[PDB]
Amino acid sequence: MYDATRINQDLFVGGFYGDVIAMRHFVRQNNVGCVVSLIDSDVAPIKRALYLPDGDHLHVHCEDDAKCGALADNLEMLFNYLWLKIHNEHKTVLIHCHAGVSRSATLAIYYIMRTNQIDYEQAFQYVYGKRAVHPSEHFVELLKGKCVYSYVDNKLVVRVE
Ligand SMILES: [Ca+2]
């Protein structure tokens, strides 16, 4: 009963509540190949308990605070990590924070926005249909800020950067 949800064939989103054994049980039972930890707490115990091979556990220290830019600062690196684990190494990814509703959900939504070239509201509803998420307002503006709307042939086409 570790609280994480399958979002699509490639991604899980969840939290962390201090029971690494439950988390390890979820990861191993569900064949999760890679874990991204987006937390402001100590990650070494999670890394140790999961014991994944070198390179299959990534940590970015980041807060959920209109003041911390660390998730935004690392969005490109995080995206490329997911893309290479999913497409080149064929792994599923657990993205987690503490509650699994804002930090982790923000990266999952962005991965779906950019791989599908769809806007925030479309990706958010897709994810929210599988797990009730609620990105903080500044993460919503971050993700919306990645979308460009360009005029062509009497339409506005969205591009996700
Ligand atoms: Ca949290």
Coordinates of N, CA, C and O and ligand atoms in Angstrom, one line a residue:
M1 N 0.8 -1.2 0.0 CA 0.0 0.0 0.0 C 0.9 1.3 0.0 O 0.5 2.3 0.6
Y2 N 2.0 1.2 -0.6 CA 2.7 2.4 -1.0 C 1.9 3.2 -2.0 O 1.3 2.6 -2.9
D3 N 1.7 4.5 -1.7 CA 0.8 5.3 -2.5 C 1.5 5.9 -3.7 O 2.2 6.9 -3.7
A4 N 1.3 5.1 -4.8 CA 1.7 5.5 -6.1 C 0.7 4.9 -7.1 O 0.1 3.9 -6.9
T5 N 0.6 5.6 -8.3 CA -0.4 5.3 -9.3 C 0.3 5.1 -10.7 O 1.2 5.9 -11.0
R6 N -0.1 4.1 -11.4 CA 0.3 4.0 -12.8 C -0.4 5.1 -13.6 O -1.6 5.1 -13.6
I7 N 0.4 5.9 -14.3 CA -0.2 7.0 -15.1 C -0.4 6.5 -16.6 O -1.4 6.8 -17.2
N8 N 0.6 5.9 -17.1 CA 0.5 5.3 -18.5 C 1.5 4.1 -18.5 O 2.0 3.7 -17.5
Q9 N 1.8 3.6 -19.7 CA 2.6 2.4 -19.8 C 4.1 2.6 -19.3 O 4.8 1.7 -19.0
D10 N 4.5 3.9 -19.3 CA 5.9 4.3 -18.9 C 6.1 4.9 -17.6 O 7.2 4.9 -17.1
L11 N 5.0 5.4 -16.9 CA 5.2 6.3 -15.8 C 4.3 5.9 -14.6 O 3.1 5.6 -14.8
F12 N 4.8 5.9 -13.4 CA 4.2 6.0 -12.1 C 4.4 7.3 -11.4 O 5.5 7.9 -11.6
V13 N 3.5 7.8 -10.7 CA 3.6 9.0 -9.8 C 3.2 8.6 -8.4 O 2.1 8.0 -8.2
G14 N 4.0 9.0 -7.4 CA 3.6 8.8 -6.0 C 4.3 9.6 -5.0 O 5.0 10.6 -5.4
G15 N 4.2 9.3 -3.8 CA 4.7 10.1 -2.7 C 5.9 9.4 -2.0 O 6.5 8.5 -2.6
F16 N 6.1 9.7 -0.7 CA 7.0 9.0 0.1 C 6.6 9.4 1.6 O 6.5 10.6 1.9
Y17 N 6.5 8.4 2.4 CA 6.0 8.6 3.8 C 6.8 7.9 4.8 O 6.4 7.7 5.9
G18 N 8.1 7.6 4.5 CA 9.0 7.1 5.4 C 9.1 5.6 5.6 O 9.9 5.1 6.4
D19 N 8.4 4.9 4.8 CA 8.4 3.4 4.7 C 9.1 3.1 3.4 O 8.4 2.9 2.4
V20 N 10.4 2.9 3.5 CA 11.1 2.5 2.2 C 10.7 1.1 1.9 O 10.9 0.7 0.7
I21 N 10.3 0.3 2.8 CA 10.1 -1.2 2.6 C 8.8 -1.3 1.7 O 8.8 -2.1 0.7
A22 N 7.8 -0.6 2.1 CA 6.6 -0.5 1.2 C 7.0 0.0 -0.2 O 6.5 -0.6 -1.2
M23 N 7.8 1.0 -0.3 CA 8.2 1.6 -1.6 C 8.9 0.5 -2.3 O 8.7 0.3 -3.5
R24 N 9.9 -0.1 -1.7 CA 10.7 -1.2 -2.4 C 9.7 -2.3 -2.9 O 9.9 -2.8 -4.0
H25 N 8.8 -2.7 -2.0 CA 7.8 -3.7 -2.4 C 7.0 -3.3 -3.7 O 6.9 -4.1 -4.6
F26 N 6.6 -2.0 -3.7 CA 5.9 -1.5 -4.9 C 6.8 -1.5 -6.2 O 6.3 -2.0 -7.2
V27 N 8.0 -1.0 -6.0 CA 8.9 -0.9 -7.2 C 9.1 -2.3 -7.7 O 9.1 -2.5 -9.0
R28 N 9.5 -3.3 -6.9 CA 9.9 -4.6 -7.4 C 8.6 -5.4 -7.9 O 8.7 -6.1 -8.9
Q29 N 7.5 -5.3 -7.2 CA 6.3 -6.0 -7.6 C 5.9 -5.5 -9.0 O 5.4 -6.3 -9.8
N30 N 6.0 -4.2 -9.3 CA 5.5 -3.6 -10.5 C 6.5 -3.4 -11.6 O 6.2 -2.8 -12.6
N31 N 7.7 -4.0 -11.4 CA 8.8 -4.0 -12.4 C 9.2 -2.5 -12.8 O 9.5 -2.2 -13.9
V32 N 9.2 -1.7 -11.8 CA 9.7 -0.3 -12.0 C 11.2 -0.4 -12.2 O 11.9 -0.9 -11.4
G33 N 11.6 0.2 -13.4 CA 13.0 0.1 -13.7 C 13.9 1.2 -13.3 O 15.1 1.1 -13.2
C34 N 13.3 2.4 -12.9 CA 14.0 3.6 -12.6 C 13.1 4.4 -11.7 O 11.9 4.3 -11.7
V35 N 13.7 5.2 -10.9 CA 13.1 6.0 -9.9 C 13.7 7.4 -10.0 O 14.9 7.6 -10.0
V36 N 12.8 8.5 -10.0 CA 13.3 9.8 -9.9 C 12.7 10.4 -8.6 O 11.5 10.6 -8.5
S37 N 13.5 10.8 -7.8 CA 13.2 11.3 -6.4 C 13.3 12.9 -6.5 O 14.4 13.4 -6.6
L38 N 12.2 13.5 -6.4 CA 12.1 15.0 -6.3 C 11.7 15.4 -4.9 O 10.5 15.6 -4.6
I39 N 12.7 15.5 -4.0 CA 12.5 15.7 -2.6 C 13.5 16.7 -2.0 O 14.6 16.8 -2.6
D40 N 13.1 17.3 -0.9 CA 13.9 18.2 -0.2 C 14.5 17.6 1.1 O 15.3 18.2 1.8
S41 N 14.1 16.3 1.3 CA 14.6 15.5 2.4 C 15.9 14.7 2.0 O 16.3 14.8 0.8
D42 N 16.4 13.9 2.9 CA 17.6 13.1 2.5 C 17.2 11.9 1.6 O 16.3 11.1 2.0
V43 N 17.9 11.8 0.5 CA 17.6 10.7 -0.4 C 18.4 9.4 -0.3 O 18.0 8.3 -0.7
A44 N 19.6 9.5 0.4 CA 20.5 8.4 0.5 C 19.8 7.1 1.1 O 20.1 6.0 0.6
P45 N 18.9 7.2 2.1 CA 18.2 6.1 2.6 C 17.3 5.4 1.5 O 17.2 4.2 1.5
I46 N 16.6 6.3 0.7 CA 15.8 5.7 -0.3 C 16.6 5.0 -1.4 O 16.3 3.9 -1.8
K47 N 17.7 5.6 -1.8 CA 18.7 5.0 -2.7 C 19.2 3.7 -2.2 O 19.2 2.7 -2.9
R48 N 19.6 3.7 -0.9 CA 20.1 2.4 -0.3 C 19.0 1.3 -0.3 O 19.3 0.2 -0.6
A49 N 17.8 1.7 0.1 CA 16.8 0.6 0.3 C 16.4 0.1 -1.0 O 16.2 -1.1 -1.1
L50 N 16.2 0.9 -2.0 CA 15.8 0.4 -3.4 C 16.9 -0.3 -4.1 O 16.7 -1.3 -4.7
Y51 N 18.2 0.2 -3.9 CA 19.4 -0.5 -4.4 C 19.3 -0.7 -5.9 O 19.7 -1.8 -6.4
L52 N 19.0 0.3 -6.6 CA 18.8 0.1 -8.1 C 20.2 0.2 -8.7 O 21.1 0.7 -8.1
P53 N 20.4 -0.3 -9.9 CA 21.7 -0.2 -10.5 C 22.1 1.2 -10.7 O 21.3 2.1 -10.8
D54 N 23.4 1.5 -10.8 CA 24.0 2.8 -11.0 C 23.3 3.4 -12.2 O 23.2 2.8 -13.3
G55 N 22.7 4.6 -12.1 CA 22.1 5.3 -13.1 C 20.6 5.2 -13.2 O 20.0 5.9 -13.9
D56 N 20.1 4.2 -12.5 CA 18.6 4.0 -12.5 C 17.9 4.6 -11.3 O 16.7 4.6 -11.3
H57 N 18.6 5.4 -10.6 CA 18.0 6.2 -9.5 C 18.6 7.6 -9.5 O 19.8 7.8 -9.3
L58 N 17.8 8.6 -9.9 CA 18.1 10.0 -10.0 C 17.4 10.8 -8.9 O 16.2 10.6 -8.7
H59 N 18.1 11.7 -8.3 CA 17.6 12.6 -7.3 C 17.9 14.1 -7.8 O 19.0 14.4 -8.1
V60 N 16.9 14.9 -7.7 CA 17.0 16.4 -7.7 C 16.5 16.9 -6.4 O 15.3 16.7 -6.1
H61 N 17.4 17.6 -5.6 CA 16.9 18.3 -4.4 C 16.1 19.6 -4.8 O 16.7 20.5 -5.4
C62 N 14.8 19.6 -4.5 CA 14.0 20.7 -4.9 C 12.9 20.8 -3.9 O 12.3 19.8 -3.4
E63 N 12.5 22.0 -3.6 CA 11.3 22.4 -2.7 C 10.1 22.6 -3.6 O 10.2 22.8 -4.8
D64 N 9.0 22.6 -2.9 CA 7.7 23.0 -3.5 C 7.4 24.3 -2.9 O 6.7 24.5 -1.9
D65 N 7.9 25.4 -3.5 CA 7.9 26.7 -2.9 C 8.1 27.6 -4.1 O 9.1 27.5 -4.9
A66 N 7.3 28.7 -4.2 CA 7.4 29.6 -5.3 C 8.8 30.2 -5.4 O 9.1 30.9 -6.4
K67 N 9.6 29.9 -4.4 CA 10.9 30.5 -4.3 C 12.0 29.6 -4.9 O 13.0 30.1 -5.3
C68 N 11.8 28.3 -4.8 CA 12.9 27.4 -5.3 C 12.6 27.2 -6.8 O 11.6 26.8 -7.3
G69 N 13.7 27.5 -7.6 CA 13.7 27.2 -9.0 C 14.3 25.9 -9.4 O 14.5 25.6 -10.6
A70 N 14.6 25.0 -8.4 CA 15.5 23.8 -8.7 C 14.8 22.9 -9.7 O 15.5 22.3 -10.5
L71 N 13.5 22.7 -9.5 CA 12.8 21.8 -10.5 C 12.8 22.4 -11.9 O 13.2 21.7 -12.9
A72 N 12.5 23.7 -12.0 CA 12.5 24.4 -13.2 C 13.9 24.4 -13.8 O 14.1 24.2 -15.0
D73 N 14.9 24.6 -12.9 CA 16.3 24.6 -13.4 C 16.8 23.3 -14.0 O 17.7 23.3 -14.8
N74 N 16.2 22.2 -13.6 CA 16.5 20.9 -14.0 C 15.5 20.2 -14.9 O 15.6 19.0 -15.2
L75 N 14.5 21.0 -15.4 CA 13.5 20.3 -16.2 C 14.0 19.7 -17.4 O 13.6 18.5 -17.7
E76 N 14.9 20.3 -18.1 CA 15.5 19.7 -19.4 C 16.3 18.5 -19.1 O 16.0 17.4 -19.7
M77 N 17.2 18.5 -18.1 CA 17.9 17.3 -17.7 C 16.9 16.2 -17.3 O 17.0 15.0 -17.7
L78 N 15.9 16.5 -16.5 CA 15.0 15.5 -16.1 C 14.2 14.9 -17.2 O 14.0 13.7 -17.3
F79 N 13.7 15.7 -18.1 CA 13.0 15.2 -19.3 C 13.9 14.3 -20.1 O 13.4 13.2 -20.5
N80 N 15.2 14.6 -20.4 CA 16.1 13.8 -21.1 C 16.4 12.5 -20.4 O 16.4 11.5 -21.1
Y81 N 16.5 12.5 -19.1 CA 16.6 11.3 -18.3 C 15.4 10.4 -18.6 O 15.6 9.2 -18.9
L82 N 14.2 10.9 -18.4 CA 13.1 10.1 -18.7 C 13.1 9.5 -20.1 O 12.8 8.3 -20.3
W83 N 13.3 10.4 -21.1 CA 13.3 10.0 -22.5 C 14.3 8.8 -22.7 O 13.9 7.8 -23.3
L84 N 15.5 8.9 -22.2 CA 16.5 7.9 -22.5 C 16.2 6.6 -21.7 O 16.5 5.5 -22.3
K85 N 15.7 6.7 -20.5 CA 15.3 5.5 -19.8 C 14.1 4.8 -20.4 O 14.1 3.6 -20.5
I86 N 13.1 5.6 -20.9 CA 12.0 5.0 -21.5 C 12.3 4.4 -22.9 O 12.1 3.2 -23.2
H87 N 12.8 5.3 -23.8 CA 13.0 4.9 -25.2 C 14.3 4.1 -25.5 O 14.3 3.2 -26.3
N88 N 15.4 4.4 -24.8 CA 16.6 3.7 -25.1 C 16.9 2.5 -24.2 O 17.5 1.5 -24.7
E89 N 16.4 2.6 -23.0 CA 16.6 1.5 -22.1 C 15.4 0.8 -21.7 O 15.4 -0.3 -21.0
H90 N 14.2 1.1 -22.3 CA 12.9 0.4 -22.1 C 12.5 0.1 -20.7 O 11.9 -0.9 -20.5
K91 N 12.7 1.1 -19.8 CA 12.3 1.0 -18.4 C 11.1 1.8 -18.1 O 10.8 2.8 -18.8
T92 N 10.3 1.4 -17.2 CA 9.2 2.2 -16.6 C 9.8 3.0 -15.5 O 10.8 2.7 -14.8
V93 N 9.2 4.2 -15.2 CA 9.8 5.1 -14.2 C 8.8 5.5 -13.1 O 7.6 5.8 -13.5
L94 N 9.2 5.4 -11.9 CA 8.5 5.9 -10.8 C 9.0 7.3 -10.5 O 10.2 7.5 -10.1
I95 N 8.2 8.4 -10.6 CA 8.6 9.7 -10.2 C 7.8 10.0 -8.9 O 6.6 9.9 -8.8
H96 N 8.6 10.4 -7.9 CA 8.0 10.6 -6.6 C 8.5 11.8 -5.9 O 9.6 12.3 -6.1
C97 N 7.6 12.4 -5.1 CA 8.0 13.5 -4.1 C 7.5 13.0 -2.7 O 7.8 11.8 -2.4
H98 N 6.9 13.9 -2.0 CA 6.4 13.5 -0.7 C 4.9 13.1 -0.7 O 4.5 12.1 -0.1
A99 N 4.1 13.9 -1.4 CA 2.7 13.6 -1.5 C 2.2 13.1 -2.9 O 1.1 12.6 -3.0
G100 N 3.1 13.1 -3.9 CA 2.7 12.7 -5.2 C 1.6 13.5 -5.9 O 0.9 12.9 -6.7
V101 N 1.5 14.7 -5.6 CA 0.4 15.6 -6.2 C 0.9 16.8 -6.8 O 0.2 17.4 -7.6
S102 N 2.2 17.3 -6.5 CA 2.6 18.6 -7.1 C 4.0 18.4 -7.8 O 4.1 18.4 -9.0
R103 N 5.1 18.3 -7.0 CA 6.4 18.2 -7.6 C 6.5 17.1 -8.7 O 6.8 17.3 -9.8
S104 N 6.2 15.8 -8.2 CA 6.3 14.6 -9.1 C 5.3 14.8 -10.2 O 5.6 14.5 -11.4
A105 N 4.1 15.2 -9.9 CA 3.0 15.3 -10.9 C 3.4 16.4 -12.0 O 3.1 16.2 -13.2
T106 N 4.1 17.4 -11.6 CA 4.6 18.4 -12.5 C 5.5 17.8 -13.6 O 5.4 18.1 -14.8
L107 N 6.5 17.0 -13.2 CA 7.4 16.4 -14.2 C 6.6 15.4 -15.0 O 6.9 15.3 -16.3
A108 N 5.7 14.6 -14.5 CA 5.0 13.6 -15.3 C 4.2 14.4 -16.3 O 4.2 14.0 -17.5
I109 N 3.5 15.5 -15.9 CA 2.6 16.2 -16.9 C 3.5 16.8 -18.0 O 3.1 16.7 -19.1
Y110 N 4.7 17.3 -17.6 CA 5.6 17.9 -18.6 C 6.1 16.8 -19.6 O 6.1 17.1 -20.8
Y111 N 6.5 15.7 -19.1 CA 6.9 14.6 -20.0 C 5.8 14.3 -21.0 O 6.0 14.1 -22.1
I112 N 4.5 14.3 -20.5 CA 3.4 13.9 -21.4 C 3.1 15.1 -22.4 O 2.9 14.9 -23.6
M113 N 3.2 16.4 -21.9 CA 3.0 17.5 -22.8 C 4.1 17.5 -23.9 O 3.7 17.7 -25.1
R114 N 5.3 17.1 -23.6 CA 6.3 17.3 -24.6 C 6.5 16.1 -25.5 O 6.7 16.3 -26.7
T115 N 6.2 14.9 -25.0 CA 6.3 13.7 -25.9 C 5.0 13.7 -26.8 O 5.1 13.1 -27.9
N116 N 3.9 14.2 -26.4 CA 2.7 14.2 -27.2 C 2.5 15.6 -27.9 O 1.6 15.6 -28.7
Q117 N 3.2 16.6 -27.5 CA 3.0 17.9 -28.0 C 1.6 18.3 -27.8 O 0.8 18.6 -28.8
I118 N 1.2 18.4 -26.5 CA -0.2 18.8 -26.1 C 0.0 19.8 -25.0 O 1.0 19.8 -24.3
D119 N -1.0 20.6 -24.8 CA -0.8 21.7 -23.8 C -1.1 21.2 -22.4 O -1.4 20.1 -22.1
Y120 N -0.9 22.2 -21.4 CA -0.9 21.8 -20.0 C -2.3 21.2 -19.6 O -2.4 20.2 -19.0
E121 N -3.4 21.9 -20.0 CA -4.7 21.5 -19.6 C -5.0 20.1 -20.1 O -5.6 19.3 -19.4
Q122 N -4.7 19.8 -21.3 CA -4.9 18.4 -21.9 C -4.1 17.4 -21.1 O -4.6 16.3 -20.8
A123 N -2.8 17.7 -20.9 CA -2.0 16.7 -20.2 C -2.4 16.6 -18.8 O -2.4 15.5 -18.2
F124 N -2.8 17.7 -18.1 CA -3.2 17.6 -16.7 C -4.4 16.8 -16.6 O -4.5 15.9 -15.7
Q125 N -5.4 17.0 -17.4 CA -6.6 16.1 -17.3 C -6.3 14.7 -17.5 O -6.9 13.8 -16.8
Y126 N -5.4 14.3 -18.5 CA -5.1 12.9 -18.7 C -4.5 12.3 -17.4 O -5.0 11.3 -16.9
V127 N -3.5 13.0 -16.8 CA -2.9 12.5 -15.6 C -3.9 12.5 -14.4 O -3.9 11.6 -13.6
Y128 N -4.8 13.5 -14.3 CA -5.7 13.6 -13.2 C -6.8 12.6 -13.2 O -7.2 12.1 -12.2
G129 N -7.1 12.1 -14.4 CA -8.0 11.0 -14.6 C -7.4 9.7 -14.0 O -8.2 8.8 -13.7
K130 N -6.1 9.5 -13.8 CA -5.5 8.3 -13.2 C -5.2 8.6 -11.7 O -5.2 7.6 -10.9
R131 N -4.8 9.8 -11.4 CA -4.4 10.1 -10.0 C -4.8 11.6 -9.8 O -4.3 12.4 -10.6
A132 N -5.6 11.9 -8.8 CA -5.9 13.3 -8.5 C -4.6 14.0 -8.1 O -4.0 13.7 -7.1
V133 N -4.2 14.9 -9.0 CA -3.0 15.7 -8.7 C -3.4 17.2 -8.7 O -4.5 17.5 -9.1
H134 N -2.5 18.0 -8.1 CA -2.8 19.4 -7.9 C -1.5 20.2 -7.9 O -1.0 20.5 -6.8
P135 N -0.9 20.5 -9.0 CA 0.4 21.2 -9.0 C 0.2 22.6 -8.5 O -0.8 23.3 -8.7
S136 N 1.2 23.0 -7.6 CA 1.2 24.3 -7.1 C 1.1 25.4 -8.3 O 1.6 25.1 -9.4
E137 N 0.6 26.5 -8.0 CA 0.3 27.5 -9.0 C 1.6 27.8 -9.8 O 1.6 28.0 -11.0
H138 N 2.8 28.0 -9.1 CA 4.0 28.3 -9.8 C 4.4 27.2 -10.7 O 5.1 27.4 -11.8
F139 N 4.1 25.9 -10.4 CA 4.4 24.8 -11.4 C 3.5 24.9 -12.6 O 3.9 24.6 -13.7
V140 N 2.2 25.3 -12.3 CA 1.3 25.5 -13.5 C 1.8 26.5 -14.4 O 1.8 26.3 -15.6
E141 N 2.3 27.6 -13.9 CA 2.8 28.7 -14.8 C 4.1 28.2 -15.5 O 4.4 28.5 -16.6
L142 N 4.9 27.4 -14.8 CA 6.2 26.9 -15.4 C 5.8 26.1 -16.6 O 6.5 26.3 -17.7
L143 N 4.9 25.2 -16.5 CA 4.5 24.3 -17.6 C 3.8 25.0 -18.7 O 4.1 24.8 -19.9
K144 N 2.9 25.9 -18.4 CA 2.3 26.7 -19.4 C 3.3 27.5 -20.1 O 3.2 27.8 -21.3
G145 N 4.3 28.0 -19.4 CA 5.4 28.8 -20.0 C 6.2 28.0 -21.0 O 7.0 28.6 -21.8
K146 N 6.1 26.7 -21.0 CA 6.8 25.9 -22.0 C 6.0 25.7 -23.3 O 6.5 25.2 -24.3
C147 N 4.8 26.2 -23.4 CA 4.0 26.1 -24.6 C 4.0 27.4 -25.4 O 3.8 28.5 -24.8
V148 N 4.3 27.2 -26.7 CA 4.2 28.4 -27.6 C 3.0 28.1 -28.5 O 2.8 27.0 -29.0
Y149 N 2.3 29.2 -28.8 CA 1.2 29.1 -29.7 C 1.6 30.0 -30.9 O 1.8 31.2 -30.8
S150 N 1.6 29.4 -32.1 CA 2.0 30.0 -33.3 C 0.9 30.0 -34.4 O 0.2 29.0 -34.5
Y151 N 0.8 31.1 -35.1 CA -0.2 31.2 -36.1 C 0.2 30.6 -37.4 O 1.3 30.9 -37.8
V152 N -0.6 29.7 -38.0 CA -0.3 29.2 -39.3 C -1.6 28.8 -39.9 O -2.4 28.1 -39.3
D153 N -1.9 29.2 -41.2 CA -3.1 28.8 -41.9 C -4.3 28.9 -41.1 O -5.1 27.9 -41.0
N154 N -4.5 30.0 -40.5 CA -5.8 30.4 -39.8 C -6.0 29.4 -38.6 O -7.1 29.2 -38.2
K155 N -4.9 28.9 -38.0 CA -5.0 28.2 -36.8 C -3.9 28.6 -35.8 O -2.8 29.2 -36.3
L156 N -4.1 28.4 -34.6 CA -3.0 28.5 -33.6 C -2.6 27.0 -33.3 O -3.4 26.3 -32.8
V157 N -1.3 26.7 -33.6 CA -0.7 25.4 -33.3 C 0.1 25.5 -32.1 O 0.9 26.5 -31.9
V158 N 0.0 24.6 -31.2 CA 0.8 24.6 -30.0 C 2.1 23.8 -30.2 O 2.1 22.7 -30.9
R159 N 3.2 24.3 -29.7 CA 4.5 23.6 -29.6 C 4.9 23.6 -28.2 O 4.9 24.6 -27.5
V160 N 5.3 22.4 -27.7 CA 5.8 22.3 -26.3 C 7.3 22.2 -26.4 O 7.8 21.2 -26.9
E161 N 7.9 23.1 -25.8 CA 9.4 23.2 -25.7 C 9.9 22.5 -24.5 O 11.1 22.3 -24.4
Ligands
CA1 CA 5.3 16.9 -1.6

